């Protein structure tokens, strides 16, 4: 803020366009790895309501179509793929299928045989799950941590 | 204003309708082949039928090979993807050559695909929970569903909601005077904050206050986006989520670009197949242009070499200016263009000529044009003799300096007098080799 | 009209080897002509191949630019079908700066022997019609609730333990949804919503599509086969919910004692009869580019018993090896060429140039005149057969542009006009000597 | 007395390009002596800099060592002065183990691309003097304190809880934003820093603010496109920017970020300032590296390349070419060559008296004339350099001016590469490998 | 006591008043020009005003360079920060080679800044607590000499508690930092039970209030890589630390010019104060080309401090070139840059003296035939053959009994161990044998 001239070079200006804080950043910048894991839940949680923000509301202006608003430096939300627009658009979020928590070999017909006339029906491709079993692995020798 | 470069003049190939090469449209003179050439290949583009067919423009240096690619970039439009590359790309620190070349290769393809959205939003102002008048045996009450009330900027409206919204609107902050939105599709509630209108009730308060949103309370439009082959791959590569100790510790750490792996091709091209073929999805092919190809490595030719008889690849445009030169990986295997040929036998060569000095002429008053300009005649065809004299970039390159000393002068337009002294001042590549040959001694 | 991923390739019109039951090669069947013995070669390999019996087999094929060996190599895939494993890796796709040589050739090999599955479960697909969930006050956690499945046969109503509630609320399932519920493992699939229960409906809280409701009894059977590659068992099982990893691709130089275990793993797996391993194929192509450890290392590899029929191709002649100074046929030391067979292919004639010209043109849709097919074939005579394959496509364009329908040769001389060769590329370049860069 | 972290350096005496307002360059100004033509071409460029209406433009420094191409770079850099972007690397600077000579050359031009946006900024900054709550929604009042007034807010429940998590005491000075609620405590006023007498982990005192204390006014931003890119480079890059960390960022951002920025000059609401990159001793890039930068000078948004190049006819760095200058035809005639010539005997004398008024040192007539003889029949660096040893044997002399006996003395002690040669070629053998 | 290491026995430069040199003083004899030179840079570095410049040490192997260069920092004493480093320390596998050059040339520059250490120490008396629940903690400190109070913050509070301090404690605080070190119970409270976990200390014999007046010292390269990433904010009590392994990176420019801004401030302020250290190189020849370059554009900037080069070697091929030859391995360019000192070689008269010096350095008692045979066989061989060969002929003496030194303990050792010349004569013979 207090500078010796109307026009004189000074970093931390991106603080102003992202929701950062002076005192926010220095507490990121040394405190640790926890302030670093709350801020990116934070991050996390406003993501939704940036992406509603840039997407549904572009009236004239801001300032009568000059000037910038918060939170215009984040751009990561613009883009068609992201994870607020991919819960948005319900289809994205079928054609991103590889989850992080689930083991998905990929897409293989399925057929479900019934019980009565012995009618057999064929399905298309859909989301297989790899077989539980297949884990069977194990270490030889398990060690206390030191 | 937006600033000049040095390709903003090139607006397409300017041919007719029966393809025949124009004299001088669309900011290009002359290479009337090449230019036929050009449109036979956007042709080919817009046919939608071949892959992985390749075209390698050779000529001289500063003869137009880049400006064509552009050419046909600009003529092709806008909804078809055009990649472009350098053959100094694909060396990286963080992934092999043949997975840069390959992640290039799904860059060049482009999905389009249509959907609708349905929100409801607004302003809160009551919620009633609206009961049924007799309970059920063993309680005291049946609530029935629930009542919000939302105003936007145009009107006020109640929609009726499942009750166990409810217990929802609870696990976030939803008190009246807030806005808030629900989608159609999802069903979930998010709050945004409270409204300007009560910005003034405080002199500080901890939330930022957002403006009443404008419009009718449930919205729904369609909208169509466009996303390449190669962004489901890293977006299927990394899942963005945060309810995980993985995902969050990624998102925590330096992102490290990872081979991805062929499998998860399959999968894709297999949803994207499906996708197409229940009518939601369109494919359109696109262009991959890579200048300076004399850079790229034996490795990276030999993995081109299987790249290109590919089914899914797109089409490539390679430009080189190299004569025959020893290829980059080998010790003294000298190739023309410094590229296999074995490689070679698979692209098509167009040719690129030198340019006559009227057409030289033609392309510096095009650029004095388009940059706006003016020059007069007489200086213009001393300009051009200079040119013609050494080549055309350091013709074209005077044109700027010449211009502001004219200003400086205070004349509106460049004479002799600015051009032989803008000369003067600058060199050229012959003079400078030659004044370094005669100064060896001192260097 | 409409465009799918697949486009047409180089090699798109070859569907086969075109054999006979008495495995003689025919002059033109399956998009494939001429070059017998190679073919030949090709079959015996093939039915080798599918019968599986031997392993760590490797098999060589070499012979002039352009001649087919690739081609041959994409017709044995063809025709070994969809279910056998087939990897094609180029010579440069395994010098990785994220795993060693030896690693990424251990991969290659593992990513072919495939192990098939049949997953058999017992599962319910029916509509909803009413959910019931009896939230407790305080007590301890114990949730208890209801649920009506009906059919346009038969109805019921299953009680809710404690796992399935969880899963069905996270899915937010409501009445008049079509679900499949799967016994064993106890997972929710989402078909859509049904068509009468959409009549009572509150304002939007589910918008998608529509569906029917499932015919018949409600309990039936569904069967899925997984064919799951033995690298990607080793992915699996190298670390503890691990999976990503299979398409993001970051595990590397996994340690061998789990490779050994993998492999003792599925030979009990295939004596107790439950799945079924499946030998593949490797293909190699331009293998003149491997390092001489890559070799050496294929020595050895070569030699086990769970191996893949690798196969290889190469168009070099006497040439020093990478990464060495020494000469040797086909670019690669005596040892590993000691170890195959080498199969070798003869240039091609007139008489079947015309006839792959004739079939690219089928698979193409393009028409030509048979003076414009005898110019072509004098072109892919003094020229290579790609330049003329090549042509095709750029003669038919032009030829369109002028509202034509027939190809004519006025079309492929003004074709041959507009783009080069590489010798008259080369010629024209002879002139320009001072005007290009370092000659 | 007081020496601050920057002294006079090798390129400290030399303030702005000296120049007319015809662009006519002066004899001696500004510190600069001779090299008429090169300054004038300098001022050209200069200009077209300035002007920023077109992009991707190259200019080649060449010359015998010891002519100023360097001199003339940093001149120019005086003379643009601050407010245009302007970033000085080396040529050697883009090796890295991180990114590849690609990215350490696409940041490096993304880095001298300046934008200028303007922000509405309100802000309340004091110290706090009393905190009242009540307990029957909480409500509270809080009082600020600067040099000319003392005020009372009544604050809201938010600010309330905001206020108990980040536990504020009397006596310290906070400054919140309104527009968004967030405090920033900035430490302890003078006055209250005696109340303790074993202070905490971290503190500290600072003067209590004075003037207005809610002040609104409007603020503008010069920020580099670079760091736009970082910022979006990955979920919290930010600290990329100092830390270095960045690696390889995504082609698929920098396309998006150009794309807003160009959609923002369309509304007015950024815009965007050209700057210089300067590639001192660029003799010694890759062939993969200058290949790059064909097709690096040809984009909407490029700066100005300025090189410098010590190179004549030589083998270019990567291939087994010889080529003038290190560099390859297919670029350079992209550029623009501007030649130096090596100073006469006057411009001699004149470039060691600006040194010496640098300095601050005295020197005699002869004294001059002995030291103009040495640099010519050596070096300019090395009589450059002969000025500050003569200083200091001098003062050990316990003397106020140097003499002609002095200068000889600091001749005889130092050497210079000539001598060195010379004397080792006599007792080679005693020396190490040749 | 302390080990005696090859460079032990040199203490300055051993000048005069009159700026000339002594023949032998602080363990230095001979290398008169060499030594009285070294003066001028000694000066020079003192006047705190010159940055960048350079110096090269030209001359054989074992003729003192180092030696000149130690002495060199002996003149300037502890006070001026003194960087030592080899060229061949520059290739790391973590960060790029200019990097590691940058990093050297920011520890050669140090701070300097006063104040007062406050100690605390003593049996904790009682932890009284007092906008109303905790405001300041009182605390009671007893030894046996005093008893006092005194008021905590509650940040210092937390710190207490953290320890898990309670009544009846040894405890140290230092006011300046916050320190709290818990001591152990008081050996009074011993008796309490009969078997505790925790540990008995006696009351402190000393006083309670201790203050004293320290002087610290911090190079700026400790302050880039504080302030590079984020500060690990862990001192036991975390398994975050547990997570990322620390790695070295690449430091920003813009980093290092905030570190530039706030040290000139500080420093305006009156707080600190700056001092121009010294960087030493040695195996300089061992540098890159691509390093090399650098060093001309760090060399000639206005915040570096002054290195000192030094080098063996002939007219040998430059690193990373394979085809040009330079002396001393260096490239003219940067050659010229230097200043350039000559280093002769020693008669046998400065040879015995040496090894005399050497002898009473390092303990041993030697005759004056003993000493002559040393001598006449170091200007046989070498010089450092007679200082290796010295301690072996004391190791025998003592063995046999006797103290001092005499003919047949040399003699002994010298048919004993053989130097490089006479072992490559060996290895000739038995060629094909080896
Ligand atoms: N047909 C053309 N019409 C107009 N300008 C041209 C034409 N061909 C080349 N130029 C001009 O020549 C300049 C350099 O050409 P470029 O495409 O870089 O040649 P090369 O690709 O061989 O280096 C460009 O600025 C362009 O404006
Ligand atoms: N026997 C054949 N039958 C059909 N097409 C062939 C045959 N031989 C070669 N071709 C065609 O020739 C083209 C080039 O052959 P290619 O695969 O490059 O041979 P190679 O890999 O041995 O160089 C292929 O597109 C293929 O369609
Ligand atoms: N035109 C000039 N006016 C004043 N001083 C100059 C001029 N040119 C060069 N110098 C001085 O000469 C010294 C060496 O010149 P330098 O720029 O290193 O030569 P080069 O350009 O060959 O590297 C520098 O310290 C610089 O201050
Ligand atoms: N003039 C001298 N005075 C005192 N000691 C010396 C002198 N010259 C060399 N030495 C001694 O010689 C030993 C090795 O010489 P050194 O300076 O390391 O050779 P170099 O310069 O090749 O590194 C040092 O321990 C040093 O004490």
């Given at each position: 803020?207090?500078?010796?001239?109307?026009?004189?070079?000074?970093?931390?200006?991106?603080?102003?366009?992202?929701?950062?804080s002076?005192?926010?950043?220095?507490?990121?910048?040394l405190?640790?790895?926890?302030?670093?894991?709350?801020?990116?839940?934070?991050?996390?949680?406003?993501?939704?309501?940036?992406?509603?923000?840039?997407?549904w509301?572009?009236?004239?202006?801001?300032?009568?179509?000059?000037?910038?608003?918060?939170?215009?430096?984040?751009?990561?939300?613009?883009?068609?793929?992201?994870?607020?627009?991919?819960?948005?658009?319900?289809?994205?979020?079928?054609?991103?299928?590889?989850?992080?928590?689930?083991?998905?070999?990929?897409?293989?017909?399925?057929?479900?045989?019934?019980?009565?006339?012995?009618?057999?029906?064929?399905?298309?491709?859909?989301?297989?799950?790899?077989?539980?079993?297949?884990?069977?692995?194990?270490?030889?020798?398990?060690?206390?941590?030191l | 204003?937006?600033?000049?470069?040095?390709?903003?003049?090139?607006?397409?190939?300017?041919?007719?309708?029966?393809?025949?090469?124009?004299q001088?449209?669309?900011?290009?003179?002359?290479?009337?082949?090449?230019?036929?050439?050009?449109?036979?290949?956007?042709?080919?583009?817009?046919?939608?039928?071949?892959?992985?067919?390749?075209?390698?423009?050779?000529?001289?240096?500063?003869?137009?090979?880049?400006?064509?690619?552009?050419?046909?970039?600009?003529?092709?439009?806008?909804?078809?993807?055009?990649?472009?590359?350098?053959?100094?790309?694909?060396?990286?620190?963080?992934?092999?050559?043949?997975?840069?070349?390959?992640?290039?290769?799904?860059?060049?393809?482009?999905?389009?695909?249509?959907?609708?959205?349905?929100?409801?939003?607004?302003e809160?102002?009551?919620?009633?929970?609206?009961?049924?008048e007799?309970?059920?045996?063993?309680?005291?009450?049946?609530?029935?569903?629930?009542?919000?009330?939302?105003?936007?900027?145009?009107?006020?409206?109640?929609?009726?909601?499942?009750?166990?919204?409810?217990?929802?609107?609870?696990?976030?902050?939803?008190?009246?005077?807030?806005?808030?939105?629900?989608?159609?599709?999802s069903?979930?509630?998010?709050?945004?904050?409270?409204?300007?209108?009560?910005?003034?009730?405080?002199?500080?308060?901890?939330?930022?206050?957002?403006?009443?949103?404008?419009?009718?309370?449930?919205?729904?439009?369609?909208?169509?986006?466009?996303?390449?082959?190669?962004?489901?791959?890293?977006?299927?590569?990394?899942?963005?989520?945060?309810?995980?100790?993985?995902?969050?510790?990624?998102?925590?750490?330096?992102?490290?670009?990872?081979?991805i792996?062929?499998?998860?091709?399959?999968?894709?091209?297999?949803?994207?197949?499906?996708?197409?073929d229940?009518?939601?999805?369109?494919?359109?092919?696109?262009?991959?242009?890579?200048?300076?190809?004399?850079?790229?490595?034996?490795?990276?030719?030999?993995?081109?070499?299987?790249?290109?008889?590919?089914?899914?690849?797109?089409?490539?445009?390679?430009?080189?200016?190299?004569?025959?030169?020893?290829?980059?990986?080998?010790?003294?295997?000298?190739?023309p263009?410094?590229?296999?040929?074995?490689?070679?036998?698979?692209?098509?060569?167009?040719?690129?000529?030198?340019?006559?000095?009227?057409?030289?002429?033609?392309?510096?008053?095009?650029?004095?044009?388009?940059?706006?300009?003016?020059?007069?005649?007489?200086?213009?065809?001393?300009?051009?003799?200079?040119?013609?004299?050494?080549?055309?970039?350091?013709?074209?390159?005077?044109?700027?300096?010449?211009?502001?000393?004219?200003?400086?002068?205070?004349?509106?337009?460049?004479?002799?007098?600015?051009?032989?002294?803008?000369?003067?001042?600058?060199?050229?590549?012959?003079?400078?080799?030659?004044?370094?040959?005669?100064?060896?001694?001192?260097? | 009209?409409?465009?799918?991923?697949?486009?047409?390739?180089?090699?798109?019109?070859?569907?086969?080897?075109?054999?006979?039951?008495?495995?003689?090669?025919?002059?033109?069947?399956?998009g494939?002509?001429?070059?017998?013995?190679?073919?030949?070669?090709?079959?015996?390999?093939?039915?080798?191949?599918r019968?599986?019996?031997?392993?760590?087999?490797?098999?060589?094929?070499?012979?002039?630019?352009?001649?087919?060996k690739?081609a041959?190599?994409?017709?044995?895939?063809?025709?070994l079908?969809?279910?056998?494993?087939?990897?094609?890796?180029?010579?440069?796709?395994?010098?990785?700066?994220?795993?060693?040589?030896?690693?990424?050739?251990?991969?290659?090999?593992?990513?072919?022997?495939?192990?098939?599955?049949?997953?058999?479960?017992?599962?319910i697909?029916?509509?909803?019609?009413?959910?019931?969930?009896?939230?407790?006050?305080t007590?301890?956690?114990?949730?208890?609730?209801?649920?009506?499945?009906?059919?346009?046969?038969?109805?019921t109503?299953?009680?809710?333990?404690?796992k399935?509630?969880?899963?069905?609320?996270?899915?937010?399932?409501?009445?008049?949804?079509?679900?499949?519920?799967?016994?064993?493992?106890?997972?929710?699939?989402?078909?859509?919503?049904?068509?009468?229960?959409?009549?009572?409906?509150?304002?939007?809280?589910?918008?998608?599509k529509?569906?029917?409701?499932?015919?018949?009894?409600?309990?039936?059977?569904?069967?899925?086969?997984?064919?799951?590659?033995?690298?990607?068992?080793?992915?699996?099982?190298?670390?503890?919910?691990?999976?990503?990893?299979?398409?993001?691709?970051?595990?590397?130089?996994?340690?061998?004692?789990?490779?050994?275990?993998?492999?003792?793993k599925?030979?009990?797996?295939?004596?107790?009869?439950?799945?079924?391993?499946?030998?593949?194929?490797?293909?190699?192509?331009?293998?003149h580019?491997?390092?001489?450890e890559?070799?050496?290392?294929?020595?050895?590899?070569?030699?086990?018993d769970?191996?893949?029929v690798?196969?290889?191709?190469?168009?070099?002649?006497?040439?020093?090896?990478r990464?060495?100074?020494?000469?040797?046929?086909?670019?690669?030391?005596?040892?590993?060429?000691?170890?195959?067979?080498?199969?070798?292919?003869?240039?091609?004639?007139?008489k079947?140039?015309?006839?792959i010209?004739?079939?690219?043109?089928?698979?193409?849709?393009?028409?030509?005149?048979?003076?414009?097919?005898?110019?072509?074939?004098?072109?892919?005579?003094?020229?290579?057969?790609?330049?003329?394959?090549?042509?095709?496509?750029?003669?038919?364009?032009?030829?369109?542009?002028?509202?034509?329908?027939?190809?004519?040769?006025?079309?492929?001389?003004?074709?041959?006009?507009?783009?080069?060769?590489?010798?008259?590329?080369?010629?024209?370049?002879?002139?320009?000597?001072?005007?290009?860069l370092?000659?």
């Amino acid at each position: 803020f207090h500078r010796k001239g109307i026009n004189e070079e000074s970093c931390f200006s991106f603080l102003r366009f992202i929701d950062i804080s002076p005192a926010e950043m220095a507490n990121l910048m040394l405190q640790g790895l926890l302030a670093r894991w709350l801020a990116l839940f934070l991050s996390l949680k406003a993501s939704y309501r940036l992406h509603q923000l840039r997407s549904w509301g572009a009236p004239e202006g801001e300032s009568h179509q000059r000037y910038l608003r918060n939170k215009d430096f984040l751009l990561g939300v613009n883009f068609p793929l992201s994870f607020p627009n991919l819960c948005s658009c319900p289809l994205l979020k079928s054609l991103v299928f590889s989850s992080h928590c689930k083991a998905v070999s990929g897409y293989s017909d399925q057929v479900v045989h019934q019980r009565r006339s012995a009618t057999s029906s064929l399905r298309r491709c859909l989301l297989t799950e790899l077989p539980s079993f297949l884990c069977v692995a194990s270490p030889r020798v398990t060690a206390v941590p030191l | 204003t937006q600033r000049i470069a040095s390709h903003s003049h090139v607006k397409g190939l300017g041919l007719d309708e029966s393809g025949l090469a124009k004299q001088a449209a669309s900011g290009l003179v002359g290479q009337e082949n090449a230019r036929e050439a050009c449109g036979v290949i956007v042709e080919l583009i817009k046919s939608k039928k071949m892959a992985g067919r390749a075209v390698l423009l050779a000529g001289p240096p500063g003869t137009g090979k880049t400006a064509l690619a552009l050419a046909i970039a600009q003529e092709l439009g806008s909804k078809v993807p055009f990649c472009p590359m350098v053959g100094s790309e694909v060396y990286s620190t963080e992934i092999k050559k043949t997975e840069v070349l390959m992640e290039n290769f799904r860059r060049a393809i482009g999905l389009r695909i249509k959907e609708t959205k349905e929100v409801y939003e607004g302003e809160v102002t009551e919620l009633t929970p609206c009961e049924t008048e007799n309970p059920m045996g063993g309680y005291g009450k049946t609530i029935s569903h629930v009542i919000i009330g939302l105003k936007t900027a145009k009107g006020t409206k109640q929609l009726k909601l499942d009750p166990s919204i409810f217990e929802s609107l609870q696990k976030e902050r939803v008190e009246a005077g807030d806005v808030i939105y629900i989608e159609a599709n999802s069903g979930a509630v998010k709050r945004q904050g409270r409204c300007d209108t009560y910005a003034t009730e405080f002199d500080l308060e901890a939330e930022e206050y957002v403006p009443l949103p404008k419009g009718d309370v449930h919205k729904k439009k369609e909208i169509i986006q466009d996303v390449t082959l190669h962004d489901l791959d890293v977006a299927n590569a990394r899942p963005q989520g945060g309810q995980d100790i993985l995902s969050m510790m990624g998102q925590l750490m330096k992102p490290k670009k990872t081979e991805i792996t062929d499998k998860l091709r399959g999968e894709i091209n297999k949803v994207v197949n499906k996708y197409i073929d229940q009518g939601i999805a369109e494919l359109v092919p696109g262009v991959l242009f890579v200048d300076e190809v004399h850079m790229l490595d034996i490795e990276c030719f030999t993995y081109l070499h299987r790249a290109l008889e590919s089914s899914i690849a797109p089409i490539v445009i390679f430009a080189s200016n190299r004569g025959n030169c020893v290829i980059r990986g080998t010790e003294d295997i000298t190739s023309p263009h410094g590229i296999p040929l074995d490689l070679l036998d698979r692209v098509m060569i167009i040719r690129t000529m030198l340019y006559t000095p009227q057409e030289m002429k033609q392309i510096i008053k095009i650029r004095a044009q388009t940059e706006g300009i003016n020059i007069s005649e007489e200086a213009l065809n001393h300009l051009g003799e200079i040119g013609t004299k050494t080549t055309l970039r350091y013709s074209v390159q005077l044109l700027t300096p010449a211009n502001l000393l004219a200003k400086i002068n205070g004349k509106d337009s460049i004479e002799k007098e600015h051009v032989e002294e803008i000369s003067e001042l600058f060199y050229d590549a012959k003079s400078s080799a030659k004044i370094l040959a005669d100064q060896q001694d001192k260097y | 009209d409409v465009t799918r991923i697949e486009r047409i390739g180089a090699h798109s019109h070859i569907r086969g080897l075109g054999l006979d039951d008495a495995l003689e090669p025919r002059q033109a069947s399956q998009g494939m002509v001429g070059q017998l013995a190679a073919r030949r070669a090709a079959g015996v390999v093939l039915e080798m191949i599918r019968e599986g019996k031997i392993a760590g087999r490797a098999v060589l094929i070499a012979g002039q630019p352009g001649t087919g060996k690739t081609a041959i190599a994409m017709g044995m895939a063809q025709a070994l079908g969809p279910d056998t494993p087939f990897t094609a890796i180029a010579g440069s796709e395994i010098f990785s700066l994220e795993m060693s040589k030896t690693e990424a050739l251990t991969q290659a090999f593992r990513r072919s022997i495939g192990v098939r599955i049949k997953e058999e479960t017992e599962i319910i697909e029916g509509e909803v019609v009413e959910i019931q969930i009896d939230r407790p006050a305080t007590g301890t956690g114990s949730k208890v609730g209801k649920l009506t499945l009906k059919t346009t046969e038969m109805e019921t109503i299953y009680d809710l333990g404690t796992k399935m509630i969880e899963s069905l609320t996270k899915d937010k399932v409501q009445a008049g949804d079509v679900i499949t519920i799967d016994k064993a493992t106890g997972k929710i699939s989402k078909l859509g919503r049904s068509f009468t229960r959409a009549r009572d409906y509150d304002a939007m809280g589910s918008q998608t599509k529509f569906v029917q409701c499932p015919d018949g009894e409600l309990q039936k059977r569904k069967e899925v086969v997984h064919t799951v590659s033995l690298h990607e068992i080793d992915v699996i099982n190298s670390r503890t919910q691990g999976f990503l990893a299979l398409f993001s691709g970051d595990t590397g130089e996994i340690k061998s004692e789990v490779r050994e275990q993998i492999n003792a793993k599925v030979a009990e797996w295939r004596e107790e009869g439950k799945a079924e391993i499946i030998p593949g194929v490797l293909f190699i192509d331009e293998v003149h580019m491997l390092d001489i450890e890559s070799f050496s290392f294929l020595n050895r590899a070569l030699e086990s018993d769970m191996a893949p029929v690798l196969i290889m191709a190469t168009n070099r002649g006497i040439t020093r090896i990478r990464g060495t100074s020494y000469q040797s046929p086909h670019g690669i030391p005596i040892d590993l060429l000691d170890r195959l067979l080498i199969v070798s292919t003869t240039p091609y004639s007139e008489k079947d140039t015309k006839q792959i010209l004739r079939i690219r043109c089928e698979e193409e849709d393009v028409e030509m005149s048979e003076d414009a097919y005898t110019v072509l074939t004098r072109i892919g005579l003094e020229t290579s057969l790609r330049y003329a394959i090549q042509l095709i496509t750029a003669a038919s364009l032009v030829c369109r542009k002028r509202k034509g329908t027939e190809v004519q040769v006025d079309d492929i001389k003004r074709v041959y006009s507009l783009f080069l060769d590489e010798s008259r590329s080369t010629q024209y370049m002879k002139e320009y000597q001072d005007a290009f860069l370092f000659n």
